[PDB]
Amino acid sequence: MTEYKLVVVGAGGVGKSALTIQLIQNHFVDECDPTIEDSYRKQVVIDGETCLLDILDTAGQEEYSAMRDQYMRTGEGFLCVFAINNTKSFEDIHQYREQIKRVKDSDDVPMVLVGNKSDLAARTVESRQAQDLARSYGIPYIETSAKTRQGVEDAFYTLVREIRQH
Numbered sequence: 001m002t003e004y005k006l007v008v009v010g011a012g013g014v015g016k017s018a019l020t021i022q023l024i025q026n027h028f029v030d031e032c033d034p035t036i037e038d039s040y041r042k043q044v045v046i047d048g049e050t051c052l053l054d055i056l057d058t059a060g061q062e063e064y065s066a067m068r069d070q071y072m073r074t075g076e077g078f079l080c081v082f083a084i085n086n087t088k089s090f091e092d093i094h095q096y097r098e099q100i101k102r103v104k105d106s107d108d109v110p111m112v113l114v115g116n117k118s119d120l121a122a123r124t125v126e127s128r129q130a131q132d133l134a135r136s137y138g139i140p141y142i143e144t145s146a147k148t149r150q151g152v153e154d155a156f157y158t159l160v161r162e163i164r165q166h
């Protein structure tokens with residue numbers, strides 16, 4: 001079957017697991033769990049194509065490492081998540097982008113930028129600037145909430161469309 005190898009990357013606590021679980025299982029998580037690596041697999045339909053998603057939900061570390069590389073290098077497409085009320089997580093996106101490019105040894109890797117927690121008010125990252133970030137990178141930008149599920153299919157399905165198009 002047509003599989004898409006996705007990887008969910010970004011700083012600790014931005015909602016990587018909540019996004020993924022909301023997509024695998026259609027409910028919201030909210031518990032104290034210092035993720036590590038855990039992969040999900042579900043057969044879904046995207047634009048009339050039956051396919052499998054194989055999703056690696058990474059740990060939010062503050063140290064790079066070979067082990068993380070060992071996990072990441074399997075991926076085809078990367079969902080780069082920050083939280084819109086966490087400015088440091090937004091600044092980190094540059095380091096992930098760089099990290100992903102080096103790990104895949106390529107200049108153009110399928111990638112989408114996600115700004116999660118859209119249900120929360122008093123944002124600290126304006127949409128305009130994140131959109132501008134993605135555009136300066138030449139990639140799509142999607143906003144999302146693991147809580148309300150708004151945008152969550154759009155973010156993951158836009159990444160598969162980036163995988164198909166590279």
Ligand SMILES: Nc1nc2c(ncn2[C@@H]2O[C@H](COP(=O)(O)OP(=O)(O)OP(=O)(O)O)[C@@H](O)[C@H]2O)c(=O)[nH]1
Pocket residue numbers: 010011012013014015016017018019029030031033034035036058059060061116117118119120144145146147148
């Ligand atoms: N309100 C709201 N809370 C969210 C959202 N996404 C995640 N959270 C909460 O934010 C916290 C962190 O979510 P996680 O999914 O554990 O974050 P993570 O990126 O996997 O963190 P690490 O695994 O440690 O790297 C939890 O309390 C979640 O319930 C969201 O869209 N809205």
Ligand SMILES: *CC(=O)N(C)CCN(C)c1ccc([N+](=O)[O-])c2nonc12
Pocket residue numbers: 032033
């Ligand atoms: C639920 C949980 O995270 N713990 C029991 C770990 C210990 N606590 C309470 C903890 C760890 C790390 C950080 N942090 O640096 O982000 C915490 N911030 O508030 N409590 C933290």
Ligand SMILES: [Mg+2]
Pocket residue numbers: 016017018033034035036057058059060
């Ligand atoms: Mg997690």
Ligand SMILES: [Mg+2]
Pocket residue numbers: 108109110138166
């Ligand atoms: Mg590209």
